[PDB]
Ligand binder design. Structure first.
Ligand SMILES: Cn1nc(N2CCCC2)nc1CCc1nc2ccc(Cl)cn2n1
Ligand SMILES: [Mg+2]
Ligand SMILES: [Zn+2]
Length: 313
């Protein structure tokens, strides 16, 4: 009840910044998350004993893959924390509650393969969910864990507040299907520029939350350069393993997943920053001015990748 979580001074200060790295001590990640819920939401959003039991079941259902692991989960939740704390009064009691959980749960039981690889392998998940395959599985795993005895952190909500919060978490998790990102942003650009964007329009919040979700999911590109660069090794470790598996089915993988095309990584990062991350953080800054630090840092890292190509590192 009167049980604040506190962090060492350096973590206490740095956690509030967009570029914060959660560090290499796994055992502090849960306490970092609870810290972030208590400051974001109030110390009374969730029964501490239920929250902790949920956090630990969530952790157990993330796998030891190089990128799409428990650390990615908490990184993506911290980005959302920084977005929520920098746009205090724009978000409902329920959105604050639901979006940090959506971020923690957004890649539950990921196997380190793309929606594409499930379909080409003919994985049962691909028969059961024809589009946003892994993303529907992720939401599906979230409801499973919420239904385990002692785990329902939403128990104090009304029947209707519950349905609202599970629907935010659903759309929020679906939104991290990057195939949907491109449409969603183009619509948000058009809407902001013609002046039609209305944050009381519930279909408009939906799109805006969808973009935050993409922005949090890609926050690897908004980190200090050594973090950005070492995270990229993990990303390519998954993608190249998928390319190996693609070749095993008798299929040329796309260049991004071919480990023979290591040499072209820097140029691949360029394409990705220009085609995906920069637009993402641009549109987000227009719509939510105080997120500008994610854009600035994204640009900085693009400039670091240009330096790599020019043999200056
Ligand atoms: C588009 N593309 N093409 C290539 N290659 C062609 C041949 C060499 C590389 N590499 C890429 C981007 C790879 C990437 N994906 C992600 C996903 C999420 C985040 Cl947070 C960062 N990244 N960085
Ligand atoms: Mg995902
Ligand atoms: Zn993710």
């Amino acid at each position: 009840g009167l049980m604040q979580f506190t962090l060492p001074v350096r973590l206490c200060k740095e956690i509030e910044l967009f570029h914060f790295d959660i560090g290499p001590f796994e055992n502090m990640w849960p306490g970092i998350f609870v810290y972030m819920v208590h400051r974001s939401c109030g110390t009374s959003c969730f029964e501490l004993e239920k929250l902790c039991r949920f956090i630990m079941s969530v952790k157990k259902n993330y796998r030891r893959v190089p990128y799409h692991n428990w650390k990615h989960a908490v990184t993506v939740a911290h980005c959302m924390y920084a977005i929520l704390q920098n746009n205090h009064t724009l978000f409902t009691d329920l959105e604050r509650k639901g979006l940090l959980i959506a971020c923690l749960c957004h890649d539950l039981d990921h196997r380190g393969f793309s929606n594409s690889y499930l379909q080409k392998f003919d994985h049962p998940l691909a028969a059961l969910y024809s589009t946003s395959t892994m993303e529907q599985h992720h939401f599906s795993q979230t409801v499973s864990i919420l239904q385990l005895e002692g785990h329902n952190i939403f128990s104090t909500l009304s029947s209707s507040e519950y349905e609202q919060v599970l629907e935010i978490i659903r759309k929020a998790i679906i939104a991290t299907d990057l195939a949907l990102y491109f449409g969603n942003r183009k619509q948000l650009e058009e809407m902001y520029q013609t002046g039609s964007l209305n944050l009381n329009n519930q279909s408009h919040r939906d799109r805006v939350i969808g973009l935050m979700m993409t922005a949090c999911d890609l926050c690897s590109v908004t980190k200090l350069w050594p973090v950005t660069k070492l995270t990229a090794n993990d990303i390519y470790a998954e993608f190249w393993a998928e390319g190996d598996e693609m070749k095993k089915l008798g299929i040329q993988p796309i260049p991004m997943m071919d480990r023979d095309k290591k040499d072209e990584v820097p140029q691949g990062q360029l394409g990705f920053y220009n085609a995906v991350a920069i637009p993402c953080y641009t549109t987000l800054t227009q719509i939510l001015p105080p997120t500008e630090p994610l854009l600035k840092a994204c640009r900085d890292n693009l400039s670091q990748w240009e330096k790599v190509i020019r043999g200056e590192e």
